[model samples]
Target: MQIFVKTLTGKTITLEVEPSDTIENVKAKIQDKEGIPPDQQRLIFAGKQLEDGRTLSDYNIQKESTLHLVLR
Candidate 1:
């Protein structure tokens, strides 16, 4: 599955990650791409912080879903 992630810098990145990937995995990927630490990462989906360990499926994110991230 492919997912879209928008960074706080206003850059949009797309990753072909598996649907089983956890929030932690997504955070890592974002950090790898944007050079931001996970501790400073804030992922907001539907206007809420995505719980740790939550999977894409848990968040109702289908293939090709788009997620937003902000840095603190």
Candidate 2:
């Protein structure tokens, strides 16, 4: 599945992830591309903050979903 990650700078990043992938895994993927650590990245979906141990499916993250990424 593909997720759209919108950044504060107005950039939208496209990530290919699996439903079983953890939120930390998602952050890792973002770090791989943007060079930001998972600890410093915050992923928000449906107005809720995503937890590191939680999977995409746990948040009901569907394909083509858009998540807001805020850097600390």
Candidate 3:
């Protein structure tokens, strides 16, 4: 599935991830792409944390869903 990620820096990145990819995986990818560490990252999807270990299915994230990332 494809997901849209919007960074706090105003950059948008699109990722094609497997359905099995957890929130943690997306976090890691964002960290790698934006150089934001996990501890310093705050991910909000549907106005929630996008908590670790939760899969897309758990969050009810559909294909082409968009999530926002705020670096603190």
Candidate 4:
């Protein structure tokens, strides 16, 4: 599935991820792309905070779903 990620700075990126992928995996990729450390990142999707160990599918993250990113 494809995911849309938006930074607090209005920066946005699209990522292709597997349903089984964990949120931590996505954070790792985001850290690489945005230079934000995983420990300092806050991810919100569907109005809920995403947990590191939780799989994307656990929250029903869908194609083109938008996740908001904030810095800690």
Candidate 5:
């Protein structure tokens, strides 16, 4: 599965993942590419703030989901 993550500056970052990946897992990937630490990443999906322990499936996230990234 793939998702689009939009930053405050309007740049969209694409991520590839499995539905079982946790929100923290996604942040780690973002950190790898963007150099932003996981602790400073806040992921929002469908108006809900994503929790570290929740999997993509837990939030019913699917392909092409757009996740908003807010910095701490």
Candidate 6:
């Protein structure tokens, strides 16, 4: 599975991940590529905030699903 990320800094990134990956897991990767802290990032999918314990499938993240990153 792949996740699309868009940061408030206008950083658009794509991560090759698995459906079983958690939001927290994705954030760690974001930290590496986007230099954005997980604590500060608000990852949104399906018009809602992604949770740490939830899998990518749990959120029903679509192929075109845009995970909006908000630094809060």
Q: Estimate every model's Cα lDDT from 0 to 1.
A: 0.80, 0.88, 0.78, 0.84, 0.88, 0.78
| Consecutive 10-residue window with the lowest summed lDDT within model 2 | 43-52
Residues 1-72, candidate 1: write the lDDT tens digits. 887887657778787776787888888887787677777888887678788898888888877777888877
lDDT of 3 by residue, 1-72 (tens): 888887757888787767788877877887787676676777788787767888888787778888887876
**TM-score, per-candidate, Cα-based:** 0.83, 0.92, 0.80, 0.89, 0.92, 0.82
TM-score of model 1 (CA atoms) = 0.83
TM-score of 6: 0.82
Q: What is the C-alpha RMSD of each candidate to the true structure, in Å?
A: 1.5, 0.9, 1.6, 1.1, 0.9, 1.6
Report the lDDT tens digits of candidate 4 across residue range 13-56.
78888888888889888878767777788899968788889888
Clashing pairs in 5: none
* lDDT score of residue 49 within candidate 4: 81
In candidate 2, what are the lDDT values of residues 1-72, reduced to their tens digit?
999988868988899999899988988898898888888999889688877898899888889999999987
Model 6: how far residue 21 lies from native, Å: 0.9
Count of backbone collisions in candidate 1:
0
Tens digit per residue, CA lDDT, model 5, 1-72: 889988878888898988888988899999998888987999989687877898999898899988899998
Model 4 clash pairs are: none
